Amino acid sequence: PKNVSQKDAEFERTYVDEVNSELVNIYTFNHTVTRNRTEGVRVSVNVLNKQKGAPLLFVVRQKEAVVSFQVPLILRGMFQRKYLYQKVERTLCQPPTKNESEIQFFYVDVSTLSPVNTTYQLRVSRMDDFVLRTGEQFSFNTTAAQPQYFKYEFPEGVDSVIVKVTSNKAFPCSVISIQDVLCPVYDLDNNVAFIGMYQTMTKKAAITVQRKDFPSNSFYVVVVVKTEDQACGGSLPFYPFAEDEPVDQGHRQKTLSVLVSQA
Amino acid sequence: PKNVSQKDAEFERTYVDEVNSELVNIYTFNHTVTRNRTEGVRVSVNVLNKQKGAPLLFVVRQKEAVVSFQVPLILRGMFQRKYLYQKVERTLCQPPTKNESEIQFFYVDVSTLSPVNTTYQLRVSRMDDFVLRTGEQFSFNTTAAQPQYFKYEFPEGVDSVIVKVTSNKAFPCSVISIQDVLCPVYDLDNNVAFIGMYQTMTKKAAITVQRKDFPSNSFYVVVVVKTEDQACGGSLPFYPFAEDEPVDQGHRQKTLSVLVSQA
Ligand SMILES: *[C@@H]1O[C@H](CO)[C@@H](O[C@@H]2O[C@H](CO)[C@@H](O)[C@H](O)[C@H]2NC(C)=O)[C@H](O)[C@H]1NC(C)=O
Ligand SMILES: *[C@@H]1O[C@H](CO)[C@@H](O[C@@H]2O[C@H](CO)[C@@H](O)[C@H](O)[C@H]2NC(C)=O)[C@H](O)[C@H]1NC(C)=O
Ligand SMILES: *[C@@H]1O[C@H](CO)[C@@H](O[C@@H]2O[C@H](CO)[C@@H](O)[C@H](O)[C@H]2NC(C)=O)[C@H](O)[C@H]1NC(C)=O
Ligand SMILES: *[C@@H]1O[C@H](CO)[C@@H](O[C@@H]2O[C@H](CO)[C@@H](O)[C@H](O)[C@H]2NC(C)=O)[C@H](O)[C@H]1NC(C)=O
Ligand SMILES: *[C@@H]1O[C@H](CO)[C@@H](O)[C@H](O)[C@H]1NC(C)=O
Ligand SMILES: *[C@@H]1O[C@H](CO)[C@@H](O)[C@H](O)[C@H]1NC(C)=O
Ligand SMILES: *[C@@H]1O[C@H](CO)[C@@H](O)[C@H](O)[C@H]1NC(C)=O
Ligand SMILES: *[C@@H]1O[C@H](CO)[C@@H](O)[C@H](O)[C@H]1NC(C)=O
Ligand SMILES: *[C@@H]1O[C@H](CO)[C@@H](O)[C@H](O)[C@H]1NC(C)=O
Ligand SMILES: *[C@@H]1O[C@H](CO)[C@@H](O)[C@H](O)[C@H]1NC(C)=O
Ligand SMILES: *[C@@H]1O[C@H](CO)[C@@H](O)[C@H](O)[C@H]1NC(C)=O
Ligand SMILES: *[C@@H]1O[C@H](CO)[C@@H](O)[C@H](O)[C@H]1NC(C)=O
């Protein structure tokens, strides 16, 4: 039958491994959390082989929710366009814990059904600046297939805050959303407009957050980068009308500086 | 390590199996398709044990896309409400094939991390009436966690069609969308308003579809059932304000009759 291999891998290490229609890989990750100090976990993977038919299939499994994606991931534009991305990065949703110190386990499983080998490099990073401190600026890089989000913990005596996010290069377009702390977090392109307050931005954005709307005394600031700059007001490129041929967008990235300040 | 079991199960059979934090089950399904005759596949599963902490995790894997969900699935309402559902049913997205006759494989994997056993019944049904014939009425049942969709093949000489969907009982509310034929199909509640033309309905809806907007000469009619009837105009129930306690909605269902007619 199918050959499944397992490993108890660790954080902060890039594993380069092969896979095919026969091999399925499993990685187990242990993680330590405390109620007072909460910190996020980022799963980032890249593929160094160009395949168009059968992509790699990745699943990240937790105690509560399951996330999954295929890579090279294909996004959508306007007129039936296809953009191909090789590196995908996503931050997991961790529910608030009950006990003071509970060790949390999560799994990453890799598979595919293409008949030929394919190499991927996978790593998990314990994100140090998951929390946003008041009056401090944080600069970070986001692409269309690397959504990010940070947790703001409302402090005592603060009735409302204002989240200000700025960029120097106007393009690409992006969407900045404020959401409650409850799994799951809609950081994908298609579901970023379901709940929360969201603004489309190209260079600057500012959203006012109030505590009465968030009974859990915290929220998530989610940043997503779009593929086509039509919404932000740009001119769409005149790429050939390839209905079933995906074209790469090259190196499209956005550097964003975020600061949460008391109102 | 983790114990993984595998089985080459068949269509039209309900398998009742146990699982825990140690067991992971794999089912392989073979499926036969032809270019002229395309027909959908439905994966339907139920859980007969009541668990609130650690749910069952299900993944359905294809050659192209991967879908995943946790059950009993928790949906969202308006004021931080939680609705729990035990049975989940979903139809897979099958891309149009190239060769005249190609056998397609797809896998269903089941796991969980709860320390106690849990029993699930899983079945796969080859949906006979995946296609919609012109001038014919089809009646079907949908719930909030059982989205459906049917493929309409535009015939020769038809410039445009009109899709008319009706119901007798006004509630629950539902969303009816028309989308192009391209994996994936957004049949979930959070992404049903990304692409395509969609109408919210309670008793009747009608959408006009044109061929010039669909170069592939086919489309998908997707039906989704909401949880709260506020959008359709109903009065929300005065359930207790349970922020972290999910309440079941009972037996909420909608019977819908759909007909696609030439304009
Ligand atoms: C989390 O899991 C990792 C993976 O096994 C543990 O890392 C091992 O720790 C032992 C104990 O010192 C070492 O002997 C091994 O060499 C480590 N493995 C590797 C690959 O370096 C880690 O200890 C676990 N965390 C905790 C808190 O126990
Ligand atoms: C965001 O991306 C930019 C561009 O890739 C990074 O700027 C580069 O940083 C490296 C490492 O310091 C330098 O070697 C390059 O010369 C820089 N290039 C440019 C054009 O500035 C930037 O460091 C990234 N930001 C973060 C936080 O990683
Ligand atoms: C698809 O897979 C099923 C699962 O094995 C196959 O069903 C078996 O078919 C053989 C051949 O007649 C029988 O001897 C077994 O008893 C069947 N098992 C079950 C569980 O049904 C099926 O044949 C496969 N399809 C094709 C076209 O080969
Ligand atoms: C949709 O659901 C209704 C209600 O469950 C089904 O109606 C039942 O059908 C069964 C089987 O024929 C009967 O034994 C029940 O008496 C019916 N109950 C009612 C209230 O009508 C209906 O058959 C379902 N539709 C489909 C296509 O499965
Ligand atoms: C199955 O695959 C695993 C993973 O590479 C390997 O360690 C094992 O030897 C394989 N078993 C057989 C019988 O080939
Ligand atoms: C966490 O913080 C609270 C108050 O901020 C404190 O009472 C508690 O002791 C802290 N937890 C630990 C493990 O120190
Ligand atoms: C906290 O830990 C104790 C023992 O370590 C356990 O009995 C209890 O169930 C834990 N709390 C939760 C909410 O799981
Ligand atoms: C994948 O690579 C290994 C080692 O390079 C090789 O033994 C194996 O045959 C390759 N897979 C296939 C399907 O050829
Ligand atoms: C591992 O689990 C499988 C699935 O139930 C079982 O068949 C097998 O005997 C188990 N192996 C051991 C060593 O317990
Ligand atoms: C499929 O239909 C086309 C025209 O409708 C026909 O030419 C072709 O022979 C059909 N395929 C098979 C396998 O009969
Ligand atoms: C169709 O089948 C033949 C052999 O049966 C194979 O060589 C060919 O690659 C198949 N077509 C596609 C598009 O894969
Ligand atoms: C699950 O059920 C089987 C048979 O009923 C039993 O042997 C096993 O111990 C159960 N699992 C646990 C964790 O007790």
Short mmCIF file of N, CA, C and O in Angstrom, two decimals, chain B residues 117-188:
data_model
loop_
_atom_site.label_atom_id
_atom_site.label_comp_id
_atom_site.label_asym_id
_atom_site.label_seq_id
_atom_site.Cartn_x
_atom_site.Cartn_y
_atom_site.Cartn_z
N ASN B 117 -12.13 7.02 22.59
CA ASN B 117 -12.69 6.52 21.35
C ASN B 117 -13.82 7.41 20.85
O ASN B 117 -14.41 8.20 21.59
N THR B 118 -14.12 7.28 19.56
CA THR B 118 -15.22 8.01 18.93
C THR B 118 -15.59 7.28 17.65
O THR B 118 -14.71 6.89 16.88
N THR B 119 -16.89 7.10 17.43
CA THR B 119 -17.40 6.31 16.31
C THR B 119 -17.99 7.23 15.25
O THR B 119 -18.73 8.16 15.56
N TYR B 120 -17.65 6.95 13.99
CA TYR B 120 -18.16 7.71 12.85
C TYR B 120 -18.63 6.76 11.77
O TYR B 120 -18.06 5.68 11.57
N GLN B 121 -19.68 7.16 11.06
CA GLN B 121 -20.16 6.44 9.89
C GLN B 121 -19.93 7.29 8.65
O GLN B 121 -20.39 8.43 8.57
N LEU B 122 -19.20 6.72 7.69
CA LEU B 122 -18.78 7.43 6.49
C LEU B 122 -19.23 6.68 5.25
O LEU B 122 -19.15 5.45 5.21
N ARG B 123 -19.69 7.42 4.25
CA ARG B 123 -20.10 6.81 2.99
C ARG B 123 -19.82 7.77 1.85
O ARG B 123 -19.74 8.99 2.05
N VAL B 124 -19.63 7.21 0.65
CA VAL B 124 -19.45 7.97 -0.58
C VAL B 124 -20.51 7.52 -1.58
O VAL B 124 -20.67 6.31 -1.81
N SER B 125 -21.22 8.47 -2.16
CA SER B 125 -22.31 8.20 -3.07
C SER B 125 -22.00 8.79 -4.44
O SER B 125 -21.66 9.97 -4.54
N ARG B 126 -22.12 7.96 -5.47
CA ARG B 126 -22.01 8.45 -6.84
C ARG B 126 -23.32 9.13 -7.22
O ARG B 126 -24.32 8.46 -7.47
N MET B 127 -23.32 10.46 -7.25
CA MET B 127 -24.54 11.24 -7.40
C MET B 127 -25.02 11.11 -8.84
O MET B 127 -24.36 11.59 -9.77
N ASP B 128 -26.18 10.48 -9.03
CA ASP B 128 -26.67 10.21 -10.37
C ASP B 128 -27.11 11.48 -11.09
O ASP B 128 -26.75 11.69 -12.26
N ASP B 129 -27.87 12.33 -10.42
CA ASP B 129 -28.37 13.56 -11.04
C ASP B 129 -27.45 14.74 -10.73
O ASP B 129 -27.85 15.76 -10.17
N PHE B 130 -26.18 14.58 -11.11
CA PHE B 130 -25.24 15.69 -11.01
C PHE B 130 -25.55 16.75 -12.06
O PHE B 130 -25.39 17.95 -11.81
N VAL B 131 -25.99 16.32 -13.24
CA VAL B 131 -26.29 17.24 -14.33
C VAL B 131 -27.75 17.66 -14.27
O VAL B 131 -28.62 16.90 -13.81
N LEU B 132 -28.03 18.87 -14.74
CA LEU B 132 -29.38 19.41 -14.78
C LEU B 132 -29.84 19.47 -16.23
O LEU B 132 -29.21 20.12 -17.06
N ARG B 133 -30.95 18.78 -16.53
CA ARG B 133 -31.53 18.80 -17.86
C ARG B 133 -32.52 19.95 -17.98
O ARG B 133 -33.20 20.30 -17.01
N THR B 134 -32.59 20.54 -19.17
CA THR B 134 -33.45 21.69 -19.38
C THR B 134 -34.92 21.32 -19.23
O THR B 134 -35.37 20.27 -19.71
N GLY B 135 -35.67 22.18 -18.55
CA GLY B 135 -37.10 21.97 -18.39
C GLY B 135 -37.49 20.85 -17.46
O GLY B 135 -38.63 20.37 -17.52
N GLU B 136 -36.59 20.42 -16.58
CA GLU B 136 -36.87 19.36 -15.63
C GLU B 136 -36.65 19.86 -14.21
O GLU B 136 -35.69 20.59 -13.94
N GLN B 137 -37.55 19.48 -13.31
CA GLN B 137 -37.51 19.92 -11.92
C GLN B 137 -36.83 18.86 -11.06
O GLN B 137 -37.15 17.67 -11.17
N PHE B 138 -35.89 19.29 -10.22
CA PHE B 138 -35.21 18.41 -9.29
C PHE B 138 -35.39 18.92 -7.87
O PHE B 138 -35.08 20.08 -7.59
N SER B 139 -35.88 18.05 -6.99
CA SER B 139 -36.12 18.39 -5.59
C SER B 139 -35.06 17.72 -4.72
O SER B 139 -34.80 16.52 -4.85
N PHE B 140 -34.47 18.50 -3.82
CA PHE B 140 -33.35 18.03 -3.02
C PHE B 140 -33.36 18.72 -1.66
O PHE B 140 -33.92 19.81 -1.50
N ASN B 141 -32.72 18.08 -0.69
CA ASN B 141 -32.71 18.54 0.70
C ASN B 141 -31.32 19.05 1.06
O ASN B 141 -30.32 18.37 0.80
N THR B 142 -31.26 20.23 1.67
CA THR B 142 -30.00 20.84 2.08
C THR B 142 -30.12 21.40 3.49
O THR B 142 -31.16 21.94 3.87
N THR B 143 -29.05 21.25 4.26
CA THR B 143 -28.94 21.83 5.59
C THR B 143 -27.76 22.79 5.62
O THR B 143 -27.10 23.03 4.61
N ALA B 144 -27.49 23.35 6.81
CA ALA B 144 -26.43 24.35 6.93
C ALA B 144 -25.05 23.75 6.72
O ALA B 144 -24.14 24.44 6.26
N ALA B 145 -24.87 22.47 7.06
CA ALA B 145 -23.59 21.80 6.91
C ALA B 145 -23.58 20.79 5.77
O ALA B 145 -22.69 19.94 5.72
N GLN B 146 -24.55 20.86 4.86
CA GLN B 146 -24.62 19.99 3.69
C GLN B 146 -24.84 20.83 2.45
O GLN B 146 -25.94 20.83 1.87
N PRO B 147 -23.83 21.58 2.01
CA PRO B 147 -23.97 22.34 0.77
C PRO B 147 -24.02 21.42 -0.43
O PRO B 147 -23.46 20.31 -0.41
N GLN B 148 -24.69 21.86 -1.48
CA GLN B 148 -24.82 21.05 -2.68
C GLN B 148 -24.50 21.89 -3.90
O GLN B 148 -24.50 23.12 -3.85
N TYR B 149 -24.18 21.22 -5.01
CA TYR B 149 -24.10 21.94 -6.27
C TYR B 149 -24.26 20.95 -7.43
O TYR B 149 -23.86 19.79 -7.34
N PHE B 150 -24.87 21.45 -8.50
CA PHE B 150 -25.14 20.68 -9.70
C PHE B 150 -24.50 21.36 -10.90
O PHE B 150 -24.38 22.58 -10.95
N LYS B 151 -24.09 20.56 -11.88
CA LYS B 151 -23.45 21.07 -13.08
C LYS B 151 -24.47 21.17 -14.20
O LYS B 151 -25.12 20.18 -14.55
N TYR B 152 -24.62 22.37 -14.76
CA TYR B 152 -25.44 22.58 -15.94
C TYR B 152 -24.54 22.66 -17.16
O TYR B 152 -23.63 23.49 -17.21
N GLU B 153 -24.79 21.78 -18.13
CA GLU B 153 -24.12 21.81 -19.42
C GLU B 153 -25.00 22.55 -20.40
O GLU B 153 -26.14 22.15 -20.65
N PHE B 154 -24.50 23.72 -20.83
CA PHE B 154 -25.22 24.56 -21.83
C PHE B 154 -25.30 23.77 -23.13
O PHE B 154 -24.24 23.33 -23.62
N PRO B 155 -26.49 23.57 -23.73
CA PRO B 155 -26.55 22.85 -25.01
C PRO B 155 -26.40 23.79 -26.20
O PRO B 155 -26.35 25.01 -26.07
N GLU B 156 -26.32 23.18 -27.38
CA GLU B 156 -26.10 23.93 -28.61
C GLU B 156 -27.32 24.78 -28.96
O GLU B 156 -28.46 24.36 -28.77
N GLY B 157 -27.06 25.97 -29.48
CA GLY B 157 -28.11 26.86 -29.92
C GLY B 157 -28.82 27.63 -28.83
O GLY B 157 -29.79 28.34 -29.13
N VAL B 158 -28.38 27.52 -27.58
CA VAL B 158 -28.99 28.22 -26.46
C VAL B 158 -28.10 29.40 -26.11
O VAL B 158 -26.95 29.22 -25.69
N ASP B 159 -28.62 30.61 -26.30
CA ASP B 159 -27.84 31.81 -26.00
C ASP B 159 -27.77 32.07 -24.50
O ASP B 159 -26.72 32.48 -23.99
N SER B 160 -28.87 31.83 -23.78
CA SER B 160 -28.90 32.07 -22.35
C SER B 160 -29.97 31.18 -21.72
O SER B 160 -30.92 30.77 -22.39
N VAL B 161 -29.79 30.89 -20.44
CA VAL B 161 -30.74 30.10 -19.67
C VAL B 161 -31.14 30.90 -18.43
O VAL B 161 -30.52 31.90 -18.07
N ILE B 162 -32.21 30.44 -17.78
CA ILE B 162 -32.67 31.01 -16.52
C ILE B 162 -32.84 29.87 -15.52
O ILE B 162 -33.51 28.88 -15.81
N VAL B 163 -32.20 30.01 -14.36
CA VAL B 163 -32.25 29.01 -13.30
C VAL B 163 -33.25 29.50 -12.26
O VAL B 163 -33.08 30.57 -11.67
N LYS B 164 -34.31 28.72 -12.06
CA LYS B 164 -35.40 29.04 -11.16
C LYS B 164 -35.40 28.02 -10.03
O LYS B 164 -35.51 26.81 -10.29
N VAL B 165 -35.30 28.49 -8.80
CA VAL B 165 -35.29 27.62 -7.63
C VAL B 165 -36.38 28.08 -6.67
O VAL B 165 -36.54 29.28 -6.42
N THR B 166 -37.17 27.12 -6.18
CA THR B 166 -38.33 27.41 -5.36
C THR B 166 -38.33 26.53 -4.12
O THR B 166 -37.73 25.46 -4.11
N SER B 167 -39.01 27.00 -3.08
CA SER B 167 -39.21 26.23 -1.86
C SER B 167 -40.59 26.53 -1.29
O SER B 167 -41.17 27.59 -1.56
N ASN B 168 -41.12 25.59 -0.51
CA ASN B 168 -42.43 25.77 0.12
C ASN B 168 -42.29 26.41 1.50
O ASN B 168 -42.87 27.47 1.75
N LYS B 169 -41.54 25.78 2.39
CA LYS B 169 -41.27 26.38 3.69
C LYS B 169 -40.28 27.52 3.52
O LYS B 169 -39.19 27.34 2.96
N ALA B 170 -40.65 28.70 4.01
CA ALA B 170 -39.83 29.89 3.80
C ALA B 170 -38.47 29.78 4.49
O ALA B 170 -37.47 30.24 3.94
N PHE B 171 -38.43 29.20 5.68
CA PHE B 171 -37.18 29.15 6.42
C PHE B 171 -36.66 27.72 6.47
O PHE B 171 -37.44 26.77 6.42
N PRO B 172 -35.34 27.51 6.58
CA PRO B 172 -34.25 28.49 6.77
C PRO B 172 -33.84 29.27 5.53
O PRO B 172 -34.23 28.95 4.41
N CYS B 173 -33.05 30.32 5.73
CA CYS B 173 -32.53 31.11 4.63
C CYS B 173 -31.47 30.33 3.86
O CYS B 173 -30.86 29.39 4.37
N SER B 174 -31.26 30.72 2.60
CA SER B 174 -30.28 30.04 1.77
C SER B 174 -29.67 31.03 0.78
O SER B 174 -30.20 32.11 0.55
N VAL B 175 -28.53 30.63 0.23
CA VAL B 175 -27.82 31.39 -0.79
C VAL B 175 -27.63 30.49 -2.01
O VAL B 175 -27.14 29.36 -1.88
N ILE B 176 -28.02 30.98 -3.18
CA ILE B 176 -27.94 30.25 -4.44
C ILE B 176 -26.96 31.00 -5.33
O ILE B 176 -27.17 32.18 -5.63
N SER B 177 -25.91 30.32 -5.78
CA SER B 177 -24.85 30.96 -6.55
C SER B 177 -24.63 30.23 -7.87
O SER B 177 -24.86 29.03 -7.98
N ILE B 178 -24.18 30.99 -8.86
CA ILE B 178 -23.81 30.47 -10.17
C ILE B 178 -22.33 30.77 -10.38
O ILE B 178 -21.92 31.94 -10.29
N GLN B 179 -21.55 29.73 -10.65
CA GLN B 179 -20.10 29.85 -10.71
C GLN B 179 -19.57 29.12 -11.94
O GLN B 179 -20.22 28.24 -12.50
N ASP B 180 -18.37 29.53 -12.35
CA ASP B 180 -17.72 28.89 -13.52
C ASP B 180 -17.23 27.50 -13.11
O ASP B 180 -17.14 27.23 -11.89
N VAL B 181 -16.93 26.67 -14.09
CA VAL B 181 -16.44 25.31 -13.85
C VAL B 181 -14.92 25.36 -13.78
O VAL B 181 -14.22 25.30 -14.79
N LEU B 182 -14.40 25.50 -12.56
CA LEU B 182 -12.96 25.52 -12.32
C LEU B 182 -12.73 25.25 -10.84
O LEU B 182 -13.28 25.96 -9.99
N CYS B 183 -11.95 24.22 -10.54
CA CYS B 183 -11.68 23.90 -9.15
C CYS B 183 -10.93 25.05 -8.49
O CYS B 183 -10.06 25.66 -9.12
N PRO B 184 -11.22 25.37 -7.23
CA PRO B 184 -12.22 24.76 -6.35
C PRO B 184 -13.58 25.46 -6.45
O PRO B 184 -13.69 26.52 -7.04
N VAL B 185 -14.62 24.86 -5.86
CA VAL B 185 -15.95 25.45 -5.84
C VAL B 185 -16.24 25.92 -4.43
O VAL B 185 -16.18 25.14 -3.48
N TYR B 186 -16.55 27.21 -4.29
CA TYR B 186 -16.75 27.82 -2.98
C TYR B 186 -18.19 27.58 -2.54
O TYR B 186 -19.10 28.37 -2.78
N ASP B 187 -18.39 26.44 -1.87
CA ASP B 187 -19.70 26.05 -1.36
C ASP B 187 -19.82 26.23 0.15
O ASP B 187 -20.85 25.89 0.72
N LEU B 188 -18.78 26.74 0.80
CA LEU B 188 -18.86 27.02 2.22
C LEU B 188 -19.60 28.33 2.47
O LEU B 188 -19.89 29.10 1.55
#
